[PDB]
Design a protein around this ligand. Structure first.
Ligand SMILES: Nc1ncnc2c1ncn2[C@@H]1O[C@H](COP(=O)(O)OS(=O)(=O)O)[C@@H](OP(=O)(O)O)[C@H]1O
Length: 155
């Protein structure tokens, strides 16, 4: 096993414990992990900062951004794996299109799906921002820094 790099894509708007769980479960399986923000409630720089403060405890996790094909990013940084989470509330056909296309564009990159834990298998950033907008207790869905920002925004 040479030096392995895995990219965990998303628009992380914002990053939730759901995403965070996938990142943490991945750190010990690749030498290098890149959380890449591609393609909104929070600005791009805002979202990177939120991810950053949320993964300070994970030394091998980098936070970068990219505009363009995710596969081009992977080819640039030498990443050969794309990590995606599979949840009960996932859009299966959407995942099929997305991943099948990435495979066509560059098959030297494998997308690996990790199934979400039962407690995060039902949330998404949308539903979370929604209840946050109505000032519900959201400490269960997002890390401290993110919750602080969401509240700040939806005050
Ligand atoms: N691991 C995990 N846990 C919980 N939720 C997750 C996870 N990964 C992706 N998502 C949510 O799936 C929706 C689409 O993801 P993205 O907007 O990042 O697009 S992309 O497919 O990742 O490119 C989007 O939620 P929506 O708010 O319903 O659009 C992402 O926040």
């Amino acid at each position: 096993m040479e030096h392995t790099i895995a990219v965990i894509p998303g628009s992380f708007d914002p990053i939730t414990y759901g995403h965070l769980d996938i990142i943490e479960r991945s750190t010990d399986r690749f030498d290098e992990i890149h959380v890449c923000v591609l393609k909104g409630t929070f600005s791009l720089e805002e979202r990177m900062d939120l991810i950053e403060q949320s993964v300070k405890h994970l030394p091998n996790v980098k936070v970068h951004q990219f505009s363009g094909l995710l596969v081009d990013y992977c080819e640039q940084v030498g990443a050969k794996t794309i990590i995606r989470g599979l949840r009960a509330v996932s859009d299966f056909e959407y995942e099929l299109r997305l991943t099948s296309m990435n495979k066509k564009l560059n098959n030297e990159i494998e997308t690996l799906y990790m199934m979400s834990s039962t407690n995060y298998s039902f949330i998404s950033s949308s539903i979370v921002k929604e209840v946050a907008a109505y000032r519900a207790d959201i400490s269960e869905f997002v890390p401290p820094y993110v919750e602080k920002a969401l509240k700040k925004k939806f005050k």
